[PDB]
Amino acid sequence: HMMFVHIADNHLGYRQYNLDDREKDIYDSFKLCIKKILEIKPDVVLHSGDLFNDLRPPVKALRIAMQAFKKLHENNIKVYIVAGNHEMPRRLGEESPLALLKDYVKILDGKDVINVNGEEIFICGTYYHKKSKREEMLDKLKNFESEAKNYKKKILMLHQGINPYIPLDYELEHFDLPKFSYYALGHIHKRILERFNDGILAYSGSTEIIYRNEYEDYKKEGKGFYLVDFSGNDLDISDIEKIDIECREFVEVNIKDKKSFNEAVNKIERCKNKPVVFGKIKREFKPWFDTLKDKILINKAIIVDDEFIDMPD
Amino acid sequence: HMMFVHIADNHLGYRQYNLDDREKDIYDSFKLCIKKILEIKPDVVLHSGDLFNDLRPPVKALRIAMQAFKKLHENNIKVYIVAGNHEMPRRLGEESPLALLKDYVKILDGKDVINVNGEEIFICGTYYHKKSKREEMLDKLKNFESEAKNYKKKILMLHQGINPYIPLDYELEHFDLPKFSYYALGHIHKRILERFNDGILAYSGSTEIIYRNEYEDYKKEGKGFYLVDFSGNDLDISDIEKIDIECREFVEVNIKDKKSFNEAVNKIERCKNKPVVFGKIKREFKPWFDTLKDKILINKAIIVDDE
Amino acid sequence: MMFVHIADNHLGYRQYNLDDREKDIYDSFKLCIKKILEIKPDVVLHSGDLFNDLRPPVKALRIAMQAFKKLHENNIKVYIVAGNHEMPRRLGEESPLALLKDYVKILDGKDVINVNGEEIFICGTYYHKKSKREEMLDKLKNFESEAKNYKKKILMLHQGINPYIPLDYELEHFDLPKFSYYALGHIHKRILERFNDGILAYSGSTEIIYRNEYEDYKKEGKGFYLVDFSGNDLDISDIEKIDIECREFVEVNIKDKKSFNEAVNKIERCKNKPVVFGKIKREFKPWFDTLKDKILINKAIIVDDE
Amino acid sequence: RGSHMMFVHIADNHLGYRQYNLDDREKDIYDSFKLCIKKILEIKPDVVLHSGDLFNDLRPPVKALRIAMQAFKKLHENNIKVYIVAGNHEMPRRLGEESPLALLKDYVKILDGKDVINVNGEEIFICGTYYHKKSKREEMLDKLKNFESEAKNYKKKILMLHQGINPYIPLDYELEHFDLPKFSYYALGHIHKRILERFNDGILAYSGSTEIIYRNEYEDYKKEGKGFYLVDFSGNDLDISDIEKIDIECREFVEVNIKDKKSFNEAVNKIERCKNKPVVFGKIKREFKPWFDTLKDKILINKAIIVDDEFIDMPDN
Amino acid sequence: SHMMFVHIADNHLGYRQYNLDDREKDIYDSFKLCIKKILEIKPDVVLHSGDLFNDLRPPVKALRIAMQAFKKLHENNIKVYIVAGNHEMPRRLGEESPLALLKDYVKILDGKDVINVNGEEIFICGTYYHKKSKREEMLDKLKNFESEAKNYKKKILMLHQGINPYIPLDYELEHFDLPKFSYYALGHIHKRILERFNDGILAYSGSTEIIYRNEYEDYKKEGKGFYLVDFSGNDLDISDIEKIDIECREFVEVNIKDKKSFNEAVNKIERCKNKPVVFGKIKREFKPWFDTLKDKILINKAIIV
Amino acid sequence: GSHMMFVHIADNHLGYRQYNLDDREKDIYDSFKLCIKKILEIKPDVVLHSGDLFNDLRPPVKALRIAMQAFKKLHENNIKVYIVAGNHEMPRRLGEESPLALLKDYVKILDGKDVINVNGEEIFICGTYYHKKSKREEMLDKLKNFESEAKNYKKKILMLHQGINPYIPLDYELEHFDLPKFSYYALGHIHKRILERFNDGILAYSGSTEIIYRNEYEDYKKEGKGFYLVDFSGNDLDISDIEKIDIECREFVEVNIKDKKSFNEAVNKIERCKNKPVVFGKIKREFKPWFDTLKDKILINKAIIVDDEFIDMP
DNA sequence: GCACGTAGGACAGC
DNA sequence: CTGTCCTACGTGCCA
Ligand SMILES: [Mg+2]
Ligand SMILES: [Mg+2]
Ligand SMILES: [Mg+2]
Ligand SMILES: [Mg+2]
Ligand SMILES: [Mg+2]
Ligand SMILES: [Mg+2]
Ligand SMILES: [Mg+2]
Ligand SMILES: [Mg+2]
Ligand SMILES: [Mg+2]
Ligand SMILES: [Mg+2]
Ligand SMILES: [Mg+2]
Ligand SMILES: [Mg+2]
C-alpha cells in the first residue's frame, strides 16, 4: 500500500583522477538509480543530500539532475531533499544548485505531514549544519520531536555524521536525535542500516566509489540505495531492501610473485568493464603488468622496489 | 506588422572586482532589459551571445536566465541565441549553460525560416569561432547566403569581432560577411550601428560596464539594446530605436590640488548611483577623501606620493 | 648464550630449469630466516654454500642481502665461510659473499666474540680443495695454538670429512684438532654426533638439491640446528633441530595397475605438488598425463620394454 | 657553470662486458666507468641522468655490482640525485626475474613515469621509461603522449629513454623521430656513438658508450671521444653552448694498414706512441707479418687481417 | 737567492668606475705602486696573466703608463711573459690587441718557449683567453703542451681562465683539464687563490685594485698585490712562495637604521686613512647629517631606498 | 750635394676607416708606410710633420703600432722629427692625453722654439698645435714671439696646422697676413697640395697622403698626393729646390650614367683603373642592373640612384 | 609454428 | 682438474 526510497550522496559531477570516464561513471550510476526508482514507482523518494558534488556544478550535471527529477515528479513520485555539505552556499545571497530543482522537489527545513494512500505520515528535516552550530540544531531537533509526538509513522531527514558511525569528525552524537520510525541520513558514504532508539537508522551511502575508502564496502555491502516499504504499522530491517547498482569496478592488487600476478590478471579479465586497479606492484613485475593497459581504466598502484622476506604463518 | 529585439553580451554572473554589488548590478541591468522587452512585446528576440559570463555560471545567474527566457517564451515571443566566446565548451562533452535554455530558445548553428505576420523571413547564425577557424567559417557563411539567395528579408547572427570595428584581434574581416538585411552581432561591448553592404550592421553592446573602458561609451552612446522594426521591405536607421538602461557609473579622478578635488566632489554628488572611483589621488589628500567611503561604491584609485 | 648453525641454502639454484624450483629454494631459505628471527639467537654460524653460483640471480642476491641486514639489525652477529660454490675461480674474480660484507663477518682466521656475558673463540676458513690439505693442516694447527687458553671453541669449515663421505672428501677425521663444536657444511644430509671430545655437525642443505637428498628429508628432515652452548659443557641434548617444509619427490615404477595406484595414492597424499621420477611403461603414458594439473614436473623414463 | 641548476647525462657503461674474452678488456670497462664517476664527483652536478645499460648483463659479475653500487652510493651520499631507465641489457626476460638495476634501489630513482624535482630554486619536470621493443611501439606512444600531457604547464622538461631513434640509426630503430614531444633535453641512450644536436624546440642527446663495447665504435671514438655530457640548464632556454662534453681516457685502438716500409713504420710509431697497450686491427700484408710479430709484447691483442694480395694500386696525388 | 720570479694579473688599466677621475687614477697609482715593488725585488722573470687593460682600445694615458712601466722593466734585462686576457682580445679579424704595442719589452705567449735563467733551464708555455665555446680547441692546445713538456722537468703554464672549482659561474675549464705543470700562472679571477694542485701549485695573483663592489673584503682577508715565487731549489711548495700585498682604496659599508648604527657608521668612516668611498643603505631620516662632513668624503653612491 | 735636406709631410689620418671598409682603413695605412719607405730611401736630415698623423684622439691599436713602427725606423736612421698636433690629435677633456704623446721617444712635439744644428749650419724652427679660430688672439701673440726670436736668424722654419684665409675661404683660423717672414711655412690642415712663394719665402701645404674626403681625387690626378722634399742648401730657398714626391693611391671614379654614352664612359673609366675603384656620382635607375655587371671590377659603389626622369638638356 | 638461456651431462686434461 | 663443448627443455615472443 506504501513504499519509499532512501537515496543520497550521488555527488553529481565529481571527476575522480581527472578522468572523463569517471565523471561519466558518476552520471551513469545516478541515472541507473533513477531508472530503477522509475521502475519501482514508490510513493516517496527521500534524498539525504550531496546530490551535487559542487556548489556550482557543470552544466551536464544540472541537465541530468533536472532531467531526472522532472521525470520523477511527472510520475507522481514525491521527493524530499535536504541540502548536503557540498550544496550549501558560502557567500551571502549565494544559491544552492538544489534551487534548480525547486519545481520537482521539496527542500526540507522543517516539518511536513504527507498523506499517502491511505495513511498520514510525518516528515521533518534540515540542511547540513556544522559541528560549530550543534547547539542550534538541538533546539531544532527537539522541536521536531515535539510536533511528532502524536504521529505513528515519523521520518527524520538529516545530512550529518553521527558519533559512533564516524570517528572524527562528526557533528552529532547518537543520543542527540529523538525517536523516529526511520532515520534518513546521508553524509557517510558507506551503507549503514541498523536498529536505533526504537526504530531504524540508515545511511544510503554513495552511489559510486567517490572517495578512497569505499573500496571494501563496494564488495561487502554494494553501492546503491534503500527501499523501505513501511506498509504495516511497524517497520523493521526485515521490510527494507537494498537496491544494488553496477558501477566502475576497482580491483586491488598485490603482485609479488607469479601467483599474485596471475590472480591480478584473473581479477582484471573477470571485470565486465575496464577496472581501476590499485594496490602494490613489485618493480620486477611492473613492465609485465604494463601489458594489460588495454584491459584497464587507470593504474593507481604504488610500485615497490623493496625486496621483502615476508613469509606466512 | 513586425518588430524585433537585438540584445547581446549581458555577461550574467560576472563579478567585477570580486564585489557582491557588481554581480547584482549585472543581474539588475539584465532583468531591466527583460522587463522593458516585455513592456515592448516584440515578435522576435535576437541574442548575439555572451549571455553568461562564464561556462559554469553561478546558480543565481541560471535561475535568472531560465525565468527570463521562460517569461519570454510564455508570451509567445520566439527567441534566438548564438553562443558567445564565454558560453563555448573547452573539453569534448562539456556542455554550454545555454543548453539549460533549450526549452525556450533556438540555439543557432545553421538556418531557420520564421513565418511572421504575414511575412516569411530567413534567419541564420552560428556560435563563436576562433580566428584560427576563419576559413571554416567562410565556408559556413557562403552556404548561408546560398540558402538565402531567394529570400528577400534575411538576418545573420554572429558573435565575433569584425576587422574595422576591432583592430586586434578579430576573427573576420568586414569584407568576409555576405549581403544580409540586418547583422545581429555580438562580442564588441561598445554600441556600433552603421550601414553595411546593402543593409544594416549592429553590435548591441554590453548591458553593463564589464571592463573599465566601456564607462565612457555609457556616457557617450548609452548602453542597452536595439529595437528594429523591419516592417517595410527596406530597413534603415530611421526604423531602429535604441533602448537605454541606467547602470553603475564610474568616476575618474586626478586629485593633486583643490581644483581636481572639488571637481571630484562635484561629479560624485552628480552621480545617481554610488560610483566606482579610479584614477589618481595625492597621498596628502588620502585621509580627506576617505570621508566619502560610505557615499561611494568602491575605491580602486591609485595613490601618488608625488604628483 | 645461544647460536644457530645453518648451511648449504644454494640460493638461486634453478633445478630442472623450473621457475617454481628456484622459488622453492628462496622460500625455504627466507623461512629459516624468519624462524631465526623469531628465535633471536646471539650468533648465526653459516658454513657456506649460501649461494649456488658466483654470479647468482639478482633476486637471490637481493634476498640474501635483505636477510642478513635484518639479522644484523637485530644485533645477531653472523659468521660465514666461503663454500665451494662461492669461491672465485679466475684471479680477481669476486665472491657474491662480498655483497654481504656489511652484515656478516667472512671467516678466514680467528675471532673472539664477547657475548652477554661470556667470552668465546671462533675460527674458520673458506673451502680448500683436496690439493691444499697440507696448507689447511697448518691453518688448523695455527688455530689450535691460538685456542689453547680458551674454554669454549668452535671451528667453522666447508669440507667433506673422510668417514662421513666415502668419495670424495678433503680432510680425514683425524685431521682436525679438538673443538667444542664443529660447525661444518658441504654434506647435504643432516649429520650430528659427538666427536673428538666435543660435537660435530653438518647442518645439511635447506632444500632438496639432488634427487639423492629425497629420502633424508623424510627420514631426518631439513632445516638447521639451534645449539645453545649456555652451560660449560655441551652435548647432543642441548641441540634443537628446526625443520623446514620443502618440495616432495615421488618415485614411480608403473608397469601394472598396482604400481599405478601406489603412485596416485602417493601423489594425492602429497602436501605440495610433487616432482615425479623413475620408470613408466609406454602403454600407460596418455593415461598418466591426466594428472599434470596435480604434478609439478614428470622426469620419469618411458619404457618400451618387456 | 654555476648554477641554480646543472646535471650530467651519462649512459651505456655496459659494466661487466668482457670483449675478446680478455680480462684486460673487462677491467677497462670497469676503469673507465670509475673515471666517469670520479669526474662527476669533482664536478658535483645536481642530477645525474643515466639512460640505461649500466650493466651489460642481466646477471652481472660480482665485481661490476660492487663497483656500480659503490659508485651510486658515493653519488647519493654527496646529495646528487640519480635517475635511471632500464636498458635493453637490464630488462628481465622470465617472469618475476629482477634487473640488476634493482640493487641500486637505495641510491637511484628508476624511472617509469613522471617526477618533478625541486632544485634551488627552480622546479623541473623529468620523465622516462624502461626499454620497450619495436613490437611495443604502440604501447609506447600512448605513454609518450601521457608525458606530453603532464608536462605542458611545465617549463623545463627532460625526457629519458633507452631506444634507437629512426634518423639516428637507419635499421633498426624502435621509434621514429616525430614520435617524441617537445622536451627541453632528450636524455637518450642505446646508440653507442656520441650524438648531440638540436631537435624540436629543444636539444636531443646520446651520451654514447663509455668504452668501446662493440667492434664498430672505432671512428666515433677518434672523432668524438668517449665519456659523458655535462649540461647546465641554468637559464630558461638551453642550447649546445651550455653543454660541455667530458672525455674519458680508455683503451686505445690503432687501425693499421701495413703495405710498405712507410705504413709499417707509421704503425710502429703510433703503437710506441700509445700510453696503454693497444688493440691493433686492420690489414697487414703477409710480407710484413712476421716483422710485426716483433711487437706482440707491445700490443694488447692483434685483430688485423693478413693480406696476401700484391696490389699495383697507385694514387694520383 | 740565485733565482726568483713574479706572478701578476688583472690590473684593468683605464677602468673608470662611476666616471671618477680619482678612481681611474687610483687604479693607475696602485699599478705603478706594484711596479715600484717589482723593481725593488729584482726577480729573474715576470709573469703577467692578462686583463692588463680594461678595453681593446684603452685611453691614451693607460697606454702611456703601461709602456713606460715595461720599458722600465725590460731595461733591467728582466724577461717578461704575458698572455692575452678576455678584455685584451680582438673582435674583427685584423683588429690588434693593445698588448701588441709591448712586443719590444715583452714576449706574448701562444705556445712554448724555453728560457735559460741563472743558472737553470726552465720551460714556459701559455695561451690567450679562449671562450667557453672554444674549450675543445683549448684542450688540444693543452695536450700539445703536455707532449712538449713530458721530457722537461720544470714546466710552467700561463692561462687566463676560470677553472670550475675556483669559480662556479662561469668557468671555461674544469680543474681536471690542465696537465701537471710546476706552476699554474692563472688570471681572470680577481680574488687571491694560492694552493697545491696536481703535482705542483696553482695560483691566481688576484686583481691589483677593487673593480667590483664585491672585492672589498677579499683585499682585507688575502691582500691584493702579486705572488713572488723563487723556485731556486729542486722542490716547489708554498714554503717557497712570498706574497707582496699592496695598499689600496678603502671602502666603507653602511646600514643606518638607528642612532647606534649611525654611530657605527661615523666610527668606521672617520677611521678611513684615505678619502673614503661610502656605499650601502641609509635611513630616510639620517641623510643630511654626514653632509656636514661630505667635503671630507669622495662620493656617496649608496643604494637608493 | 748636399749639406742639408728635409721632408715636409702631413695629414695621413691614420686609422681612418672610410665607408666602414677594411680596405680603406688599410689603404690609409699602406700609403703611409709607403711614404716612410720613400723617406728612408731618401735619408733626409729632418722630418717636419704638420699634424693630423692620426685621425682621432683615440686611434685604433693597429694605427698606433704602424705609426710607432714608422717613427722608430726614422729615429734609428738618425733622422730627427718635429711634429705639431692636428685638430684631431688635440685633447678635449682636461687630463686627456694626445695619441702623439705615445711617440715622444722618436719625435719632438713643437709648442715653442727649437734650433737644430745641422752639418754644418744652425737653423731655427718654431711651431704650435692646432688652435681654434676663437683663439686666434692667443696665436698672434704667440706668433710675434716667434718672429721676435727669429729676427737674427737667416734660416728659419715655421710649422703650423691651421687653415689660412685665402688658401681656404671658410673656415680658417689665421689670415695670410697673420704669419711673419720665415724661410718655409710647413702647413698642414688643408688636404690639397699648395706650394707658392710668400713673404719673401715659401709657404706649403703638403696635402693628405690619401683621399680622405671624396673630393680630393682630381686634386690627386691634377697635382698628385704625397709629401714635399726641401733641400734648403743655400741661404734662400725657392720652388727650384723643392721636389714633390707622389704616391699611388686608391682611385675613385665619378659616374653620371643617364644615357648609353655615359654608361660606356663609366665602364671605360672603371676598366682603365689599376686598382678596384671607389665609384660615386649618379646612376639612373634604368641603368642600375646593367652597372651591377661591374661589381667584380669595383671596390664599393657609392653612387646615388636617380629614378627621376630629368629633362636635363643644356 | 620460433628463439633463447639455463641446466645438465661429458669429454679434454699441459 | 677449470674449462668448454654437446644436448635437452623451460618460458616467453609470435604469428
Ligand atoms: Mg558526500
Ligand atoms: Mg556529505
Ligand atoms: Mg564576446
Ligand atoms: Mg562579451
Ligand atoms: Mg653445497
Ligand atoms: Mg659445498
Ligand atoms: Mg642499449
Ligand atoms: Mg648499449
Ligand atoms: Mg679576465
Ligand atoms: Mg678580469
Ligand atoms: Mg687638420
Ligand atoms: Mg686634416
Neighbours of chain C (3+ CB pairs under 8 A): A, D
E190 labelled binding-site residue = yes
B94 touching A, CB under 8 A?
yes
**Which of D27, D59, D63 has its CB closest to that of C57?**
D59
Residue of E nearest to F60 (CA): E57
Domain A1-248 has CATH 3.60.21.10: yes
Q: For nucleotide H14, give the residue with the nearest CA to its C1'.
A: D135
Contact A143, A149 (CB under 8 A): no
- Spatial distance between the Cα atoms of D143 and B260, rounded to a whole number of angstroms: 64
| Active-site entry in F3, F8, F49, F88 | F88
What DSSP character marks residue D182? P
- Spatial distance between the Cα atoms of E251 and A44, rounded to a whole number of angstroms: 88
Which run of H or E residues covers position D143? helix D137-151
Q: Which experimental technique did the depositors report for determining this structure?
A: X-ray
E160 labelled binding-site residue = yes
Q: Which residues of D are catalytic?
A: 89
- Spatial distance between the Cα atoms of C4 and C225, rounded to a whole number of angstroms: 6
A287 touching D, CB under 8 A?
yes
Q: Is D92 close to A284, i.e. CB distance below 8 A? A: yes
Biggest alpha carbon distance in chain E? 70
Q: Which residues contact A181 (CB under 8 A, 6 or more apart)?
A: A152, A153, A154, A155, A199, A200, A230, A235
**In the structure grid, which three cell numbers stand for residue A231, read together?**
506498509
- Spatial distance between the Cα atoms of A204 and A278, rounded to a whole number of angstroms: 25
Beta-strand relationship, A276-282 and A298-304: parallel
Residue whose grid cell is 694579473: E9
Cα D31 to Cα D49, D64, F113: the distances in Å are 20, 11, 81
* Domain D252-317: CATH class, spelled out: alpha beta
Architecture in CATH of C248-306: 2-Layer Sandwich (3.30)
Q: How far is A261 from chain D (nearest CA, A)?
A: 9
CB C116 within 7 Å, strand H: no
Rg (CA), chain C: 21
Residue ranges of A 294-313 with Cβ closer than 8 A to chain C: 307-309, 311
**In the structure grid, which three cell numbers stand for residue F273, read together?**
683603373
> To probe the interface with A, which of C33, C34, C36 has the most A CB atoms within 10 Å?
C34
Q: Prior bond to F206 cis, omega within 30?
A: no
Architecture in CATH of D1-251: 4-Layer Sandwich (3.60)
Write the single-letter amino acid at E289. Answer: W
What DSSP character marks residue E81? E
The backbone region for E221, taken as left when phi is positive above 0, alpha when psi lies in -120 to 50, beta otherwise, is: alpha
- Spatial distance between the Cα atoms of B69 and B73, rounded to a whole number of angstroms: 6
* Domain F251-314: CATH class, spelled out: alpha beta
Question: φ, ψ for residue C280 (rounded to 5)?
Answer: -135, 130
Q: Which nucleotide is nearest to C210 (CA to C1')?
A: G8
Contact F187, F161 (CB under 8 A): yes
Contact F302, F19 (CB under 8 A): yes
Q: How far is E91 from chain D (nearest CA, A)?
A: 19
Domain residue spans in chain F? 1-250, 251-314
Which residues on C lie below 8 Å from D102 (Cβ)?
58, 62
Contact C70, C100 (CB under 8 A): no
Q: Is C66 close to A258, i.e. CB distance below 8 A? A: no
The distance from CA F26 to its chain's CA centroid, rounded to whole angstroms, is 17
How many helices (H) and strands (E) in chain A? Answer: 6, 15
Neighbours of chain B (3+ CB pairs under 8 A): A
- Spatial distance between the Cα atoms of B11 and B87, rounded to a whole number of angstroms: 10
Which run of H or E residues covers position A186? none
Q: After which residues do gaps appear in chain C, with C to N over 2.5 Å?
A: none
CATH of domain A249-313: 3.30.160.600
D39 touching E, CB under 8 A?
yes
Ligand nearest to the CA of D85: 7
3-state secondary structure of E217: helix
**Which of E139, E170, E176 has its CB closest to that of D42?**
E176
In whole angstroms, G6 C1' to B142 CA is 74
SS3 of chain B: the string is CCCEEEECCCCECCCHHHCHHHHHHHHHHHHHHHHHHHHHCCCEEEECCCCECCCCCCHHHHHHHHHHHHHHHCCCCEEEECCCHHHCCCCCCCCCHHHHHCCCEEECCEEEEEECCCCEEEEEECCCCCHHHHHHHHHHHHHHHHHHCCCCCEEEEEECCECCCCCCCCCECHHHCCCCCEEEEECCCCCEEEEECCEEEEECCCCCCCCHHHHHHHHHCCCEEEEECCCCCCCCHHHEEEEECCCCCEEEEEECCHHHHHHHHHHHHHCCCCCEEEEEEEHHHHHHHHHHHHHCCEECCEEECCC
Contact E136, D224 (CB under 8 A): no
**In the structure grid, which three cell numbers stand for residue D85, read together?**
631507465
Nearest to E221 by CA among E182, E193, E184: E193
Beta-strand relationship, D185-189 and D202-206: parallel
Helix, strand, coil percent values for chain F (each to nearest 5): 30, 25, 45
Biggest alpha carbon distance in chain B? 70
**B39-77 per-residue burial string, b: 16 or more CB within 10 A, e: under 16:** ebebbbbbbbbbbbbbbbbbbbbbebbbebbeebbeeeb
Nearest to A201 by CA among A169, A168, A175: A175
**Which of C23, C30, C65 has its CB closest to that of A311?**
C30
Cα F309 to Cα C56, F258, F313: the distances in Å are 96, 9, 12
Please, do chains F and A touch (3+ CB pairs < 8 Å)? no
Ligand nearest to the CA of E162: 9
Q: Is D66 close to C98, i.e. CB distance below 8 A? A: yes
The backbone region for B104, taken as left when phi is positive above 0, alpha when psi lies in -120 to 50, beta otherwise, is: alpha
**In the structure grid, which three cell numbers stand for residue E266, read together?**
661615523
CB C219 within 7 Å, strand H: no
Q: For nucleotide H13, give the residue with the nearest CA to its C1'.
A: D135
Which run of H or E residues covers position F14? none
CB D138 within 7 Å, strand H: no
SS3 of F242-280: the string is EEEEECCCCCEEEEEECCHHHHHHHHHHHHCCCCCCEEE
D142 touching A, CB under 8 A?
yes
Fold of C1-247: Purple Acid Phosphatase; chain A, domain 2 (3.60.21)
CATH of domain E250-305: 3.30.160.600
* Domain B249-307: CATH class, spelled out: alpha beta
- Spatial distance between the Cα atoms of F163 and F189, rounded to a whole number of angstroms: 6
C102 touching D, CB under 8 A?
no
- Spatial distance between the Cα atoms of B219 and B34, rounded to a whole number of angstroms: 22
The distance from CA D307 to its chain's CA centroid, rounded to whole angstroms, is 34
Residue whose grid cell is 654527496: D78
Across the beta sheet with A154-158, what order do the strands follow? A110-115, A120-125, A154-158, A182-185, A199-203, A192-196
Q: C157 - beta bridge partners? A: C184
D234 touching E, CB under 8 A?
yes
- Spatial distance between the Cα atoms of E272 and D168, rounded to a whole number of angstroms: 67
Q: Which residues contact D247 (CB under 8 A, 6 or more apart)?
A: D225, D226, D227, E139
Cα F127 to Cα E282, F145, F146, F157, F189: the distances in Å are 56, 11, 8, 8, 14
Contact C280, C301 (CB under 8 A): yes
Residue whose grid cell is 539567395: B149
3-state secondary structure of A240: strand
Which residues on E lie below 8 Å from F21 (Cβ)?
none
Cα A203 to Cα A156, A177, A188, A215, E206: the distances in Å are 12, 15, 7, 17, 80
**In the structure grid, which three cell numbers stand for residue E192, read together?**
687571491
Beta-strand relationship, E183-186 and E155-159: parallel
Q: Is D97 close to A306, i.e. CB distance below 8 A? A: no
Pick the CATH number of E1-249 from 3.40.50.880, 3.60.21.10, 3.40.50.970, 3.40.50.720: 3.60.21.10
3-state secondary structure of C78: strand
**Which of E139, E171, E176 has its CB closest to that of D1?**
E171
What DSSP character marks residue E137? H
Contact C121, C143 (CB under 8 A): no
CATH of domain F1-250: 3.60.21.10
Q: Resolution of this entry in Å?
A: 3.5
- Spatial distance between the Cα atoms of F94 and B178, rounded to a whole number of angstroms: 76
Which residues on C lie below 8 Å from A311 (Cβ)?
27, 30-31, 34
D239 touching E, CB under 8 A?
no
Q: Is F102 close to E57, i.e. CB distance below 8 A? A: no
A53 touching B, CB under 8 A?
no
E295 labelled binding-site residue = no
**Which of A58, A93, A95 has its CB closest to that of B56?**
A58
Q: Which residues of D are annotated as a binding site?
A: 12, 14, 53, 88, 162, 190, 192
Across the beta sheet with E121-126, what order do the strands follow? E111-116, E121-126, E155-159, E183-186, E200-204, E193-197
> To probe the interface with D, which of C17, C54, C58, C94 has the most D CB atoms within 10 Å?
C58
What DSSP character marks residue E265? H
Which run of H or E residues covers position F6? strand F6-9
Ligand nearest to the CA of C82: 6
Q: B226 - beta bridge partners? A: B6, B242
Contact A124, A149 (CB under 8 A): no
**D273-294 per-residue burial string, b: 16 or more CB within 10 A, e: under 16:** ebeeebbbbbbbbeebeeebee
Question: φ, ψ for residue D228 (rounded to 5)?
Answer: -155, 170
D59 touching C, CB under 8 A?
yes
Residue of B nearest to A64 (CA): B100
Q: Which residues contact F257 (CB under 8 A, 6 or more apart)?
A: F263, F266, F281, F282, F283, F284, F287, F291, F303
